[PDB]
Amino acid sequence: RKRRPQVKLTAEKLLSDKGLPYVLKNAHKRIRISSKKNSYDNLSNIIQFYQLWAHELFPKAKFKDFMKICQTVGKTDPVLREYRVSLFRDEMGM
Amino acid sequence: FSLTVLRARIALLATAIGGPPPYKLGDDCLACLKDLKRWFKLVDDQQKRWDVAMAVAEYRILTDDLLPILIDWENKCSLAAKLANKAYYDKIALNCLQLLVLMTWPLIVTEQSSSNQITLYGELKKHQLVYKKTILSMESGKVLRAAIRLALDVIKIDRLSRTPRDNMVLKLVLNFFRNVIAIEPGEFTINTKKSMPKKGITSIDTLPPNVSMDDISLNTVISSFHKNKVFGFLLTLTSSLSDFINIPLLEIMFYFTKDVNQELLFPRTSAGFELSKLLQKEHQMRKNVIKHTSARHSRFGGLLSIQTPDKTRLTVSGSQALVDEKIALQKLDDSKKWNKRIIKKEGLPNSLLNSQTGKAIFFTESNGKHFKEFINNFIDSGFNILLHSVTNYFTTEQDRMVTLEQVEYLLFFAWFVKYQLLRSKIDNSADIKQVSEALKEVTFILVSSLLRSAYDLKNWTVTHAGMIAFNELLNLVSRTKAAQDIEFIVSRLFSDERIQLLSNLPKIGSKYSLQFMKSCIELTHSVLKVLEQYSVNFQKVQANYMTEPVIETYINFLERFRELEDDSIKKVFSFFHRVFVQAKEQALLFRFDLIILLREMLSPDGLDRMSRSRKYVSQFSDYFLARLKKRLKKSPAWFVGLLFPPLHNSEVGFYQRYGE
Amino acid sequence: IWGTNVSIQECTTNFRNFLMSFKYKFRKILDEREEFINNTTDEELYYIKQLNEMR
DNA sequence: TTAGAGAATTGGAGAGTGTGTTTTTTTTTTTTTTT
DNA sequence: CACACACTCTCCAATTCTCTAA
């Protein structure tokens, strides 16, 4: 009767297992930094982590569309801002 | 049945006027000319049919009969003017030129216009180009020499001795010049009543076979103007300014310069050096292109698996991916066939209202040299006098000015005041006082009032007509300050009332044409430099500029690096460069949009390697990465906060954007 | 490489270290050639000489 | 000006009407001009 | 004949929009 609706970026999907915990864990042990190397290589390595996170979290949409939708959701949906405030408060304790 | 009867009458008039092989005036020629004029006037406005003009163009009347009338009258006029029924032989050209200007009148289609006008607009715009094609190529286009006779007959007498009737003759003849040169190809009005198929519009060339883009460009118009001596006519008409010869003349000599850039004037086998440079550039970009293509054929079958996190065995093809992992990831990215929806949007003579930066009309070197001195002679003759003549009229009927007047006036003013300053910059032989007369208080306040009034009515085109002048206002203030109190009264009213208007347009115009976005960056760049010599506060004006939509509209211009020039990238990057240490507000710059554009910039597929743009940008990006690493290493949550937009909470606003 | 459980990096390193520092003497001793006394044609870096010839 | 309740439109899957094939010139007679 | 292709006919929920929301 009706086609299966396309999967969109729901709030629950943003907290997937291969998501925020994964990047928070691997930020300090995934990407190497060296100013001696050309800046293009460093920038590509930095964007590699986010690109793989987006693909293994949402292989339907591309890079730019995914980031645009995420930015619009963050500017619109206040739950993301609340979560960011909560993590900021937690980090402020140290 | 009515239409074919109309065609029959047009053919009957065509064989009644006469023909060649010298053209002969048939019996009752004046009567048939008056009949044709009456019929065309009746069908133009009283009935609004636009069908008589069509029949006239069909019989090639303008080419076969009308033009030879003026050509045959030219030799008689020359003989009569050099020797030392003249009234009958003079009045015959009046009706012919009145018909010519009427057919050459630009056609405007709006919502209130009926279906016949819009239906026939696409079929008559090509004939409009045909008229100017055959006029310009008719033995050096001498019909304009006959046209200027229809003006010198009336202007010869004293201006105080003008005629309440003959005064309309000057308007009628003057309209012909602006009408012939405003003829431009239209737009293919696609019938969007149904969904378009898997294929787009086949041909966008709206030119009949007799009309070629070679024979209709503004280069042809300028060459015809030079070869027909009408440069002297345009100079002498302005030399005697000291009403009705101002509004038409405002656009008679503006149409061919409404969109022509002044950069082509100065070069900064002669044409072949730029040819060799362009061949080098295209060879470089083609060399960059082949870096992705495989050394062998496509069917070689290079298959690989990327052992991505989670031990994934995703399969992506291509021997190019076997060279670099980044190429494999890019092939992963572009493999998806799904795309999002990108939203998108001239009613007046096309120009900056609709012209991209690369639309530089090709000019012959001799033609360019002639045009370099023609406009300079006009400026040295009557520029400021013509401006002061229309200053009084501009001060009245503010709400009675149709939207055409603003686009035909503000663009003229801004273009010429910009040209004078650039010409003074390149060469010191021109004084700044030749353009300094535009700093009048009343003119400035009226143009500012028009600019601010155009904002509330959503007339974005009219407002864009105003920013181009507002840029040169600040530019001329700076020029007259550096090269020097008259500048203060013009550059002190933007204290509190005008700061909102200048700081709101960048935040809202990012969803419109490219040139609308380009105007605001020039406005900010000029305003940040005019006030640098006096600092009302440098740290206070910049506070209202550092806003997230402003950064968004600046970075949205950088995504077009395939067409951005050296100065276009220079201004955008220098806006952030000048606030790196002077303002220290880099926290709002931490969006991924700028990082991906930096990756595109330093990549060889973007900016040129041999040019002088990617070196300082690369070094500044090297420092940018150091700043990013330093700021990210001190906040684990900032690793993911770099993607999300900033927050409105009180404490975090200073905790994250300033680091306590 | 898909379907092989073979890393491209190790293959590239193997071929790289095979390119230079390799001499035709290795081939001369691989086939048990008795006349391996030759020095210039065997002990010289054959592939380095080939790369120089290409250059 | 912000996070959130209301209208308004149209693209991506699917109902459906009509298509498009397979499909062939070998081998064997009979004639005709040169040989 | 019928299975696969190309494409006109036809249709609701996610995507955009501007009046009333905080």
UniProtKB/Swiss-Prot annotation, chain A:
<comment type="function">
    <text>Forms a fork protection complex (FPC) with TOF1 which is required for chromosome segregation during meiosis and DNA damage repair. FPC coordinates leading and lagging strand synthesis and moves with the replication fork. FPC stabilizes replication forks in a configuration that is recognized by replication checkpoint sensors and protects stalled replication forks against the fork-releasing activity of RRM3 helicase.</text>
</comment>
<comment type="similarity">
    <text>Belongs to the CSM3 family.</text>
</comment>
<comment type="subunit">
    <text>Component of the fork protection complex (FPC) consisting of TOF1 and CSM3.</text>
</comment>
<protein>
    <recommendedName>
        <fullName>Chromosome segregation in meiosis protein 3</fullName>
    </recommendedName>
</protein>
Swiss-Prot record, chain B:
<dbReference type="GO" id="GO:0000076">
    <property type="term" value="P:DNA replication checkpoint signaling"/>
</dbReference>
<dbReference type="GO" id="GO:0007064">
    <property type="term" value="P:mitotic sister chromatid cohesion"/>
</dbReference>
<dbReference type="GO" id="GO:0043111">
    <property type="term" value="P:replication fork arrest"/>
</dbReference>
<dbReference type="GO" id="GO:0051321">
    <property type="term" value="P:meiotic cell cycle"/>
</dbReference>
<dbReference type="GO" id="GO:0003677">
    <property type="term" value="F:DNA binding"/>
</dbReference>
<comment type="subunit">
    <text>Component of the fork protection complex (FPC) consisting of TOF1 and CSM3. Interacts with WSS1 and ESC4.</text>
</comment>
<keyword id="KW-0236">DNA replication inhibitor</keyword>
<dbReference type="GO" id="GO:0043570">
    <property type="term" value="P:maintenance of DNA repeat elements"/>
</dbReference>
<comment type="similarity">
    <text>Belongs to the timeless family.</text>
</comment>
<keyword id="KW-0227">DNA damage</keyword>
<dbReference type="GO" id="GO:0006281">
    <property type="term" value="P:DNA repair"/>
</dbReference>
<keyword id="KW-0539">Nucleus</keyword>
<comment type="function">
    <text>Forms a fork protection complex (FPC) with CSM3 and which is required for chromosome segregation during meiosis and DNA damage repair. FPC coordinates leading and lagging strand synthesis and moves with the replication fork. FPC stabilizes replication forks in a configuration that is recognized by replication checkpoint sensors and protects stalled replication forks against the fork-releasing activity of RRM3 helicase.</text>
</comment>
<dbReference type="GO" id="GO:0043596">
    <property type="term" value="C:nuclear replication fork"/>
</dbReference>
<protein>
    <recommendedName>
        <fullName>Topoisomerase 1-associated factor 1</fullName>
    </recommendedName>
</protein>
UniProtKB/Swiss-Prot annotation, chain C:
<protein>
    <recommendedName>
        <fullName>DNA replication licensing factor MCM4</fullName>
    </recommendedName>
</protein>
<comment type="similarity">
    <text>Belongs to the MCM family.</text>
</comment>
<comment type="subunit">
    <text>Component of the MCM2-7 complex. The complex forms a toroidal hexameric ring with the proposed subunit order MCM2-MCM6-MCM4-MCM7-MCM3-MCM5; loaded onto DNA, forms a head-head double hexamer.</text>
</comment>
<comment type="function">
    <text>Acts as a component of the MCM2-7 complex (MCM complex) which is the putative replicative helicase essential for 'once per cell cycle' DNA replication initiation and elongation in eukaryotic cells. The active ATPase sites in the MCM2-7 ring are formed through the interaction surfaces of two neighboring subunits such that a critical structure of a conserved arginine finger motif is provided in trans relative to the ATP-binding site of the Walker A box of the adjacent subunit. The six ATPase active sites, however, are likely to contribute differentially to the complex helicase activity.</text>
</comment>
